[PDB]
């Protein structure tokens, strides 16, 4: 449906009020069901009108003229719902033409650290709400971990490149606001073992299925055997996979032992039968000789001599009958023993080639989580699974940077300004920063509130890149320690000609060892110009950062030469290698749910800091230091849409604090 689709596309249940809505409309959620339905329709219809045209501001008056009775009768209710949706960034977010030009009277002063997507989204909101906003950005560009390489006609993303499903995704609205050239990712992905030969379809499917079954198994291990702590430490996904694999190898050996034991049991039953026959044959042989002697006493004979012949005859035929039955049993046992000798259970759980192809699937998971599986929380690593958008994954053909650049239009952004210290007190805040080009140039920014969107990698840094005065409390620093911050890198290879399969967006390289499984394991064909992107994931990510570009590119060309032929792969005209762990403005790629962490740490990251009073005995201060970024949003961590959502959230929160709700 329509109003129902608007709710779904805003990540809202269409037939129920949320906790956020309960908080701003306690009168309605505690009141009769009929008014709740009226509220829900007003909300869903306002969402719909905005979604049906996100290029222009949806104003309260516009909304009301489009509502029809009975819903447009309580204009206070409509105005409340519209203001709520606007304040929380569910309508009139991103880049839209403004009906009412922005009032010149600004209220409050906010410094935003970082002009990645979260920082930029917050800034746009806060400026829309009438506040004075300045962003401080250490790099010489916007976008942060949205970072597009551009040279000539070559365009390639060094950070985020995939828009997940558009259904429920706020990047859907943005894509109608910005010229993004979105293109579906065909998920067909051939694998080539290290010898350049393709993985036979038989094997590609067997091992992928086993991969999925090993994952279900770890989840069974987690949820049914409560295998979540081992030797006083939290169990990891990788560690649980080891246990599962060991048990499948154990079961194969158990099965072999059971099988050969059936053969032993049968062999021994046969041995016992043969001994019985050998003795019976001898008894029969001796008995025959007796019957022979007695029958050669020639007639006429007395009746005892006759009885001797006739009773030896009788005894002999009975023993022969006994022997014939034992020989029938012998052929049945030799049958059973020939069937067993032909039904051997499996020899191995996984051959070497199998385990290599399996490692490719593990490397693929290490890519998606940007971290080795030995660091992922077994209990929680997939905790954002229930929030996946619907629809095909897509790439940004003209470079994802078009989004942050578009968001930056109109904002006051100081590039080349590295924040060094954040000061927050009951009367306001001071942010101290230096010019990255000449660090002696120092800058002081005073403001009512600081929105920190520094990456979790930067917050983790010891000794710190950024000092908080007073220091962040332990509940926040402990969360910063526990959370995972991973790593993932890309190699951009620009050629003058296409030598790969043009109708295939992915293909895999199956590394020879587990250690190296993440090293150049996946190649992407995503762009108009002949460009391949190669991924370095898992344990390889961090190690390959200490290897020169020429060696990394060499390894790439070697792999591709093996798959496509040595004469088919020219030298690249341009190459770029990312090193995100080493990037001091990132210190990694994106967060992961580490063993020992959980979804609640993302909530802790999002919680603002409130200073103590200046004068003792003075009233409770308001919060002063806010946080956004992909590490601050429990349900959509580690994505662009999660960062954007986190900025929208904080801007509503800050505006509620400093403008009133």
């Amino acid at each position: 449906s329509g109003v129902e689709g608007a709710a779904f596309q805003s990540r809202l249940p269409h037939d129920r009020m949320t906790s956020q809505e309960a908080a701003c409309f306690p009168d309605i959620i505690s009141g009769p069901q009929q008014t709740q339905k009226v509220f829900l329709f007003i909300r869903n219809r306002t969402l719909q009108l905005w979604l049906d045209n996100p290029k222009i501001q949806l104003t309260f008056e516009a909304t009301l003229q489009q509502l029809e009775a009975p819903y447009n009768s309580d204009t206070v209710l409509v105005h409340r719902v519209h203001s709520y949706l606007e304040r929380h960034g569910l309508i009139n977010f991103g880049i839209y033409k403004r009906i009412k030009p922005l009032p010149t009277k600004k209220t409050g002063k906010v410094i935003i650290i970082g002009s990645g997507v979260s920082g930029l989204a917050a800034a746009r909101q806060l400026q829309s709400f009438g506040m004075d906003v300045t962003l401080l950005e250490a790099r010489d560009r916007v976008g942060g971990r949205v970072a597009t390489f551009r040279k000539g006609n070559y365009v390639a993303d060094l950070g985020a490149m995939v828009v997940t499903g558009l259904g429920g995704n706020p990047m859907a609205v943005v894509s109608k606001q910005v010229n993004m050239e979105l293109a579906k990712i065909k998920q067909k992905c051939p694998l080539y073992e290290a010898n350049g030969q393709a993985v036979p379809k038989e094997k590609d499917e067997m091992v992928e299925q086993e991969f999925n079954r090993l994952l279900e198994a770890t989840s069974y291990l987690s949820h049914q055997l409560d295998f979540n702590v081992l030797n006083n430490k939290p169990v990891s996904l990788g560690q649980a996979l080891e246990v599962v694999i060991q048990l499948q190898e154990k079961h194969v050996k158990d099965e072999q032992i059971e099988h050969w034991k059936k053969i032993v049991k049968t062999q021994e039953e046969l041995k016992e039968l043969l001994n019985k026959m050998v003795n019976l044959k001898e008894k029969i042989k001796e008995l025959h000789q007796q019957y022979k002697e007695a029958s050669e006493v020639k007639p006429p004979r007395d009746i005892t001599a006759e009885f001797l012949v006739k009773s030896k005859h009788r005894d002999l035929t009975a023993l022969c009958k006994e022997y014939d039955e034992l020989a029938e049993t012998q052929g049945k046992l030799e049958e059973k023993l020939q069937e067993l000798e032909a039904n051997p259970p499996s020899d191995v759980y996984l051959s070497s080639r199998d385990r290599q192809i399996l490692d490719w699937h593990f490397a693929n998971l290490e890519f998606a989580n940007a971290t080795p599986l030995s660091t992922l929380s077994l209990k929680h690593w997939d905790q954002d699974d229930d929030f996946e958008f619907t629809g095909s994954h897509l790439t940004v053909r003209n470079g994802y940077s078009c989004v942050p650049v578009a968001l930056a239009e109109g904002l006051d952004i100081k590039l080349n300004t590295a924040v060094r210290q954040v000061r927050y007190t009951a009367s306001g805040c001071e942010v101290i920063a230096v010019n990255t080009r000449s660090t002696s140039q120092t800058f002081i920014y005073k403001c009512d509130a600081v929105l920190c969107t520094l990456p979790l990698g930067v917050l983790k840094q010891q000794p710190p890149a950024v000092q908080f005065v007073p220091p962040l409390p332990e509940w926040k620093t402990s969360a910063v320690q526990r959370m995972g911050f991973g790593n993932l890198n890309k190699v951009v290879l620009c050629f003058d000609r296409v030598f790969w399969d043009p109708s295939v967006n992915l293909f895999g390289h199956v590394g020879s060892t587990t250690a190296s499984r993440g090293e150049l394991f996946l190649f992407w064909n995503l762009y108009k110009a002949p460009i391949l992107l190669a991924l370095v994931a898992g344990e390889a990510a961090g190690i390959m950062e200490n290897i020169s570009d020429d060696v990394i590119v060499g390894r790439c060309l070697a792999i591709l030469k093996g798959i496509f032929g040595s004469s088919a792969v020219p030298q690249p005209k341009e190459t770029v290698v990312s090193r995100w762990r080493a990037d001091p403005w990132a210190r990694g790629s994106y967060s992961y749910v580490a063993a020992g962490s959980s979804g609640n740490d993302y909530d802790l990251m999002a919680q603002p800091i409130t200073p103590g009073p200046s004068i003792p005995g003075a009233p409770q201060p308001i919060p002063r230091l806010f946080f956004a970024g992909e590490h601050t949003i429990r349900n959509y961590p580690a994505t662009v849409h999660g960062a954007l959502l986190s900025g929208l959230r904080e801007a509503g929160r800050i505006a509620d604090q400093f403008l009133g709700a």
């Binding site: 069974y220 048990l247 062999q267 009773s311 009975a318």
Partner: protein
């Protein structure tokens, strides 16, 4: 509720994780256990193969031809004397006694037991067969 064909008992999980090198120890002892079961199959095969070589020839040099005899209702003196010896040797095994005489049914044997019980001291003869 494990995936089909996956094997994951609580018992085994603890065995493979109770120790730092527990898993490899588990799979090692299973390997050696399979080696000693295969070793044992080799011995019994080779033992059975020697037994089969003794049964070469079956019992064919020793099987007598089977004669059918028309089952006659009348007892010659010779057939009575056979029966008494058959009783002496086989006891109440009416089938064996029939096979010795050749022309007397199991019922006729059993009836013989009663009719000549007195004249042939058949009770003495059964007692005689029981002493050995």
């Amino acid at each position: 509720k494990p995936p089909k064909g996956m094997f994951l008992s609580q018992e085994d999980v603890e065995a493979v994780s109770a120790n730092a090198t527990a898993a490899t120890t588990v799979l090692r002892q299973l390997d050696m256990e399979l080696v000693s079961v295969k070793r044992q199959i080799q011995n019994i095969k080779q033992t059975n193969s020697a037994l089969k070589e003794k049964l070469d020839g079956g019992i064919e040099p020793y099987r007598l031809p089977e004669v059918i005899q028309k089952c006659n209702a009348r007892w010659t003196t010779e057939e009575q004397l056979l029966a008494v010896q058959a009783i002496r040797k086989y006891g109440r095994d009416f089938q064996a006694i029939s096979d010795v005489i050749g022309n007397k049914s199991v019922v006729q044997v059993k009836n013989f037991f009663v009719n000549y019980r007195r004249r042939f001291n058949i009770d003495e003869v059964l007692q005689e067969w029981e002493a050995e």
